[PDB]
């Protein structure tokens, strides 16, 4: 029986390679490991406190554009929608 | 998205490139004594099965134990990786 961190499990669909079957490969992968992101006025969701609940550090905190990575406009409107939702009773 | 070019630098060496070496293996051994001496008292009736380890850690060398090559890699692959304009 064996630990997870040591056994790639490529799905059958893919193309397994001799190297692919190696630990090096496992490490490699790790290293290289959204309707809002799609393009919907994030502000329009000024209420729906459900959608906004997403891009939230789960501590009433929005995220720096290192995680959210949403468009400047999308993220700022998402942030505005969250702030507006705070005003709109729900969330 | 990802993108962060740097400004030219004297050299892109690395500071103390941390290779990683386990903490004085003895330091862990002595620590566990005080991690089983705080409770059970000194030379715990259990620590007998512990001091057995911190013994030779000292003995000949009270301190059982009294690098990296990236700086040249950097020195050689910076005047190439840096996207400086021509000249």
């Amino acid at each position: 029986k064996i630990d997870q961190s040591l056994s790639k499990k490529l799905p059958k669909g893919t193309i397994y390679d001799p190297f692919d079957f190696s630990m090096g490969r496992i490490h490699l992968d790790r290293k290289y490991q959204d309707i809002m992101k799609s393009g919907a006025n994030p502000l329009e969701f000024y209420a729906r406190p459900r959608i906004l609940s997403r891009y939230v550090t789960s501590t009433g905190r929005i995220q720096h554009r290192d995680i959210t990575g949403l468009s400047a406009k999308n993220q700022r409107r998402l942030s505005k929608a969250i702030r507006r939702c705070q005003a709109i009773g729900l969330m | 998205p990802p993108v962060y070019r740097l400004p030219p630098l004297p050299r892109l060496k690395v500071k103390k490139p941390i290779i990683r070496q386990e903490a004085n293996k003895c330091l862990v051994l002595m620590s566990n004594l005080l991690q089983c001496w705080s409770s059970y008292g000194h030379m715990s009736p259990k620590c007998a099965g512990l001091v057995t380890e911190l013994k030779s850690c000292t003995s000949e060398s009270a301190l059982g134990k009294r690098k990296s090559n990236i700086n040249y890699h950097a020195a050689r692959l910076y005047d190439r990786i840096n996207g400086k304009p021509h000249d």
Partner: protein, 267 residues
């Protein structure tokens, strides 16, 4: 040519020290006359059997890679005159010009070589150790493969007085005569310093300018077409390219060397 040979004997099974000589006879002789690959470039070519200065063509250059330039991101604007356009983020060189530039370049070498010229081909990217050595082999020129000792030309009577100098005649025949201390102790200036990787050998280019010595190089889409007497638009990177261009210059030199060693025969 096999002094250390003991032709097995009579029953002895083919000696595996000479069995190979059978394969050698199986080569130069029978070899593979039945089917012979033709119309195919070989890295072996160029460096040895190169195009005479007049035999060059745009296609020959495009094939040898004397066109692919640096990226459309590292372009010293100083060559909007030698660039032909951008492709796949690479600035393709106007080989039409490269030809004119190579034509002239070759001319200088031949003329120089026809005048006891001291050529010194310089290249430092990896691989040119032979192409260059062989290049000077033909023109009886001189070559440098490693880094260029900064100071070779200007600070000569210090960096290069340990090495000895030979008195050569018009047929390049060592005179086999004594050269006095002071006589052999001076300056042996080159009369045509060819550079093959200008991008990173300026120390030589700048020195030669201040050494009143003509230069001939292989500018790219990055090297500055100005620090050299005869710039030759080309691709500094790949070695097939350089070896093609160097080759053309080399044979241009050889022909002159030939023509020169021929006047001597008239008398």
């Amino acid at each position: 040519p096999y002094p250390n040979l003991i032709p097995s004997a009579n029953d002895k099974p083919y000696s595996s020290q000479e069995l190979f000589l059978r394969q050698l006879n199986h080569s130069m002789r029978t070899a593979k006359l039945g089917a012979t690959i033709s119309k195919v470039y070989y890295p072996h070519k160029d460096i040895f059997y190169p195009p005479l200065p007049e035999n060059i063509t745009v296609e020959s250059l495009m094939s040898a890679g004397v066109h692919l330039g640096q990226s459309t991101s590292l372009w010293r604007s100083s060559t909007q005159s030698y660039i032909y356009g951008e492709y796949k983020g690479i600035h393709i060189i106007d080989l039409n010009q490269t030809l004119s530039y190579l034509k002239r370049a070759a001319k200088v070498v031949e003329g120089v070589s026809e005048s006891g010229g001291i050529i010194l081909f310089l290249g430092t990217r990896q691989g040119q150790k032979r192409g260059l050595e062989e290049a000077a082999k033909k023109t009886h020129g001189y070559y440098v493969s490693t880094r260029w000792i900064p100071g070779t030309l200007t600070n000569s009577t210090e960096i290069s007085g340990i090495w000895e100098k030979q008195e050569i005649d018009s047929n390049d025949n060592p005179t086999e005569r004594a050269l006095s201390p002071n006589e052999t102790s001076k300056q042996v200036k080159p009369d045509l310093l060819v550079v093959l990787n200008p991008t990173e050998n300026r120390n030589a280019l700048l020195e030669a300018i201040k050494s009143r010595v003509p230069t001939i190089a292989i500018i790219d889409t990055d090297s500055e077409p100005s620090l050299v007497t005869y710039p030759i638009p080309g691709n500094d990177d790949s070695l097939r390219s350089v070896n093609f261009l160097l080759g053309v210059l080399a044979r241009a030199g050889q022909r002159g060397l030939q023509n020169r060693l021929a006047r001597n025969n008239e008398k």
